[PDB]
């Protein structure tokens, strides 16, 4: 019933996030892992944010050379699922910077239909389990903010038809998901990211129709206070503090959930949000709004500047303020950076707002103020979820969590899992794969002299590359490459004592002789259309194949990741 959902930005892997590779995600603590994000143009074609990150980076895996088709985050997500079958993996489309083309795509049925088709192919080739639509937001006119993000599309083509068209798009997605799930024998899910505030909901979100279609919906109950306002507040508070002024009324988890429910949202489908980062203001004066919470709801002075010189009350960020690359002063520090934050903003004292169940940091002399989630407030959100029969918690984002006793970033993720689920292992799911089109031939080679015999074996990858566009052709290529092939041969009364180039080495494992092509640089990625032809040595000469029972192959993403997709490619009759 419950979910623990996590966003992983593709830019986690670069220096700005400390080079955080998916193998250090605590996948056994999550039910759902969202790849953030895939883009798409006005014609419904998928578009990578960063091709290398998605399909090529080695991600710290020994024996992956940059660009090898088994590289990239999307393949690493498959490995996380194999190593942690509690996990479902999924793709988030859109986000704040890549929602610019939803309006046009949703308005036109033929384009909606092409977009859906492209998404279905994408999750087929990546073996993903769900689609997450992050249209942020329908009905909401927004211009790109190129100071914050040179790559921001905004939502400049927003209109009042978005609300209705969004439902059509979700209907088309869920129908296609239904159909492809039955074809592949798997269960797909559809989720969406939703806004916290009434005003955006009224413009873009037909609540009761939406919750009738989706499997669950993630409410973005964070970024609810920030440097865009000159009043300090909680950005991700569980409860509305009674002393909150008009701008922050309704802008808490509890109030947003109550609003969605009142509009027909089913409780079990509602997932609430936790922020793994701060927002904050440079100089907040205590107006005494709540003497029990000094500096909360106080007045922030407009004393700093954005990287385009716009005056702002926002505090400095963890990352340097660069025009087009985090250009707005927003007091944004990762949760794993709270000690860095305290070293830069000295004199911060830690306060707990027991009415909001939210922490904040405030220096009452300088005025500096930061709002965030900690272990305690995550536990309170989980308590609330359990008690209101809600659907779980979602976090933004994985790379900002702190480490504890290993290289995994897992302090808050482990707090969230354990408060939602207890200490027990998460439920595990079956993982299915589509068998590849692999054939083979086995021919005795007559030995007239010497000791032993020989079997000449051929294995052919008959896959064929079909797809167009960068995104679908790269993920198709990866899916249609046979990776680290192991050949399992069962015999009746005959030993395979050796193999010759270009085979990999032979070993005996239980009843099987095993040829390991992952151990051969030339053997470990077998491209669509390639044949491997090679000799096997036998302890006795043969004239037929009656002594061979069966030949199977399995794959691995990396030499040291789990075997998957074991399939029979030859059998004796």
Q: Which of 35, 77, 96, 488 binds ligand DW0 (CB under 6 A)?
A: 96
The two three-digit tokens of residue 43, written as one number:
């014609």
Q: Does 223 bind ligand DW0 (CB under 6 A)?
A: yes
Q: Does 318 bind ligand DW0 (CB under 6 A)?
A: no
Q: Tell me the CA distances in angstroms from 297 to 190, 244, 247, 356, 370, one per residue in order.
A: 38, 7, 10, 13, 12
Distance (Å, whole) CA 154 – CA 342: 33
Which residue number, 268 or 563, has a Cβ lying nearer to Co ion? Answer: 268
Q: Does 334 bind ligand DW0 (CB under 6 A)?
A: no
Q: Does 148 bind ligand DW0 (CB under 6 A)?
A: yes
Q: Does 267 bind Co ion (CB under 5 A)?
A: no
Contact 411, 403 (CB under 8 A): yes
Which residue number, 230 or 366, has a Cβ lying nearer to ligand DW0? Answer: 230
Choose the stretch contacting ligand DW0; rule: CB under 6 A; options: 124-132, 147-155, 461-469, 558-566.
147-155
Residue 299 backbone class (left: φ over 0; alpha: ψ -120 to 50; beta: rest) = beta
What is the footprint of ligand DW0 within residues 30-59 (CB under 6 A)?
37, 49
| Closest CA relative to residue 471, chosen from 49, 48, 34, 44 | 48
Distance (Å, whole) CA 517 – CA 70: 15
Which residue number, 11 or 352, has a Cβ lying nearer to ligand DW0? Answer: 11
Which residue number, 264 or 320, has a Cβ lying nearer to Co ion? Answer: 264
Residue whose entry in the numeric block shows the structure tokens 């990741």: 561
What is the footprint of ligand DW0 within residues 380-409 (CB under 6 A)?
396
Q: Does 149 bind ligand DW0 (CB under 6 A)?
A: yes
The two three-digit tokens of residue 172, written as one number:
């088309």
> Around Cβ 446, how many Cβ atoms within 10 Å?
9
Residue whose entry in the numeric block shows the structure tokens 């030995």: 447
Residue 148's binding partner among Co ion, ligand DW0, none (Cβ under 5 to 8 angstroms by kind) is ligand DW0
Residue 49's binding partner among Co ion, ligand DW0, none (Cβ under 5 to 8 angstroms by kind) is ligand DW0
Tell me the closest approach of the beta carbon of residue 275 to ligand DW0, in angstroms: 7
Q: Does 228 bind ligand DW0 (CB under 6 A)?
A: yes
Q: Does 206 bind ligand DW0 (CB under 6 A)?
A: no
> Around Cβ 180, how many Cβ atoms within 10 Å?
16
Q: Does 11 bind ligand DW0 (CB under 6 A)?
A: yes
**HEC per residue, 100-115:** CCHHHHHHCHHHHHHH
Q: Does 95 bind ligand DW0 (CB under 6 A)?
A: yes
The residue count for binding ligand DW0 (CB under 6 A) is 20
Residue 502's binding partner among Co ion, ligand DW0, none (Cβ under 5 to 8 angstroms by kind) is none
Q: Does 97 bind ligand DW0 (CB under 6 A)?
A: yes
* Phi, psi of 318, rounded to the nearest 5 degrees: -60, -45
Q: Does 308 bind ligand DW0 (CB under 6 A)?
A: no
Q: Which of 10, 189, 215, 410 binds ligand DW0 (CB under 6 A)?
A: 10
Which residue number, 8 or 188, has a Cβ lying nearer to ligand DW0? Answer: 8
Q: Does 252 bind ligand DW0 (CB under 6 A)?
A: no
Q: Tell me the CA distances in angstroms from 70 to 58, 490, 543, 556, one per residue in order.
A: 8, 29, 39, 9
Residue 149's binding partner among Co ion, ligand DW0, none (Cβ under 5 to 8 angstroms by kind) is ligand DW0
Q: CB-based burial of residue 261 (10 Å sphere; 0-12 exposed, 13-18 middle, 19+ buried)?
A: middle
Which residue number, 320 or 529, has a Cβ lying nearer to ligand DW0? Answer: 320
Report DSSP state, residue 565.
E
Q: Tell me the CA distances in angstroms from 339 to 335, 345, 370, one per residue in order.
A: 9, 10, 13
Q: Tell me the CA distances in angstroms from 152 to 98, 183, 203, 307, 325, one per residue in order.
A: 7, 37, 21, 16, 10
Give the rounded distance of the alpha carbon of 102 from its chain centre: 20
Contact 269, 218 (CB under 8 A): no
Peptide bond into 214 cis (omega under 30): no
Residue 264's binding partner among Co ion, ligand DW0, none (Cβ under 5 to 8 angstroms by kind) is Co ion
Q: Which of 52, 117, 145, 535 binds ligand DW0 (CB under 6 A)?
A: 145
Which residue number, 212 or 366, has a Cβ lying nearer to Co ion? Answer: 212
Tell me the closest approach of the beta carbon of residue 553 to ligand DW0, in angstroms: 36
Which residue number, 226 or 331, has a Cβ lying nearer to ligand DW0? Answer: 226
Residue 208's binding partner among Co ion, ligand DW0, none (Cβ under 5 to 8 angstroms by kind) is Co ion
What is the footprint of Co ion within residues 184-213 (CB under 5 A)?
208
Using CB under 6 A, list all residues that contact ligand DW0.
9-11, 37, 49, 95-97, 134, 136, 145, 148-149, 152, 197, 222-223, 226, 228, 396
Using CB under 5 A, list all residues that contact Co ion.
208, 264
């Amino acid at each position: 019933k419950l979910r623990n959902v996590m966003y992983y930005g593709d830019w986690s892997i670069w220096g700005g996030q400390g080079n955080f590779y998916p193998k250090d995600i605590p996948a056994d603590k999550l039910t759902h892992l969202n790849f953030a994000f895939m883009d798409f143009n006005s014609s419904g074609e998928l578009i990578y944010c960063d091709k290398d990150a998605a399909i090529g980076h080695p991600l710290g895996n020994l024996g992956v050379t940059y660009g090898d088709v088994n590289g990239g985050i999307l393949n690493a997500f498959q490995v996380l699922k194999s190593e942690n079958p509690n996990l479902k993996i999924g793709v988030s489309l859109g986000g704040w910077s890549k929602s610019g083309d939803f309006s046009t795509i949703a308005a036109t049925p033929s384009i909606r239909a092409k977009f859906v088709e492209n998404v279905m192919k994408f999750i087929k080739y990546t073996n993903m389990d769900f689609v997450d639509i992050d249209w942020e937001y329908p009905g909401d006119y927004r211009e790109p903010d190129k100071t914050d993000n040179i790559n921001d599309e905004g939502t400049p083509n927003a209109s009042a038809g978005d609300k209705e068209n969004y439902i059509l798009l979700l209907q088309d997605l869920k129908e296609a998901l239904n159909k492809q799930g039955k074809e592949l024998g798997k269960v797909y899910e559809l989720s969406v990211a939703l806004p916290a505030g009434v005003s955006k909901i009224e413009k873009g979100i037909d609540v009761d129709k939406l919750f009738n279609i989706v499997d669950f919906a993630n409410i973005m109950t964070y970024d609810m206070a920030g440097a865009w306002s000159t009043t300090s507040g909680h950005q991700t508070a569980l409860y509305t503090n009674p002393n909150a002024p008009e701008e922050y009324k309704g802008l808490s988890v509890d109030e947003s959930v109550k609003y969605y429910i009142s509009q027909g949202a089913e409780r079990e489908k509602i997932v609430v949000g936790a922020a793994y980062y701060t927002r904050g203001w440079e100089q907040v004066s205590d107006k005494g709004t709540d003497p029990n919470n000094p500096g909360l709801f106080g007045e922030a002075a407009v004393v700093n500047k954005d990287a385009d010189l716009s005056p702002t009350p926002g505090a400095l960020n963890e990352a340097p303020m660069k025009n087009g690359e985090g250009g707005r002063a927003g007091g944004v520090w990762g949760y794993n950076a709270l000690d860095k934050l305290k070293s830069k903003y000295t004199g911060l004292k830690e306060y707990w707002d027991d009415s909001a169940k939210a922490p904040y940091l405030y220096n009452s002399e300088t005025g500096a103020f930061f709002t965030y989630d900690n272990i305690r407030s995550i536990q309170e959100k989980a308590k609330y979820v359990k008690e209101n029969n809600l659907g779980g918690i979602i976090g933004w984002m994985a790379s900002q969590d702190a480490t504890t006793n290993s290289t995994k970033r897992d302090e808050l993720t482990t707090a969230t899992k354990e408060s939602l689920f207890g200490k027990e292992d998460l439920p595990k799911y079956e993982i299915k794969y589509t068998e590849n089109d692999i054939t083979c031939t086995v021919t005795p080679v007559k030995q007239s002299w010497g000791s032993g015999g020989v079997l000449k074996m051929s294995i052919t990858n008959n896959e064929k590359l079909d797809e167009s566009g960068e995104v679908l052709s790269t993920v198709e290529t990866s899916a249609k490459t046979v990776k680290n092939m192991k050949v399992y041969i069962k015999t009746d009364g005959i030993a395979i004592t050796g193999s010759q180039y270009p085979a990999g080495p032979v070993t005996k494992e239980g009843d099987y002789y095993v040829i390991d092509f992952g151990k051969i640089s030339d053997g470990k990625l077998m491209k669509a259309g390639i044949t491997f032809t090679f000799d096997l040595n036998l302890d006795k000469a043969i004239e037929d194949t009656n002594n061979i029972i069966s030949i199977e192959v399995s794959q691995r993403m990396y030499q040291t990741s789990p075997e998957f997709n074991r399939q029979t490619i030859w059998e004796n009759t």
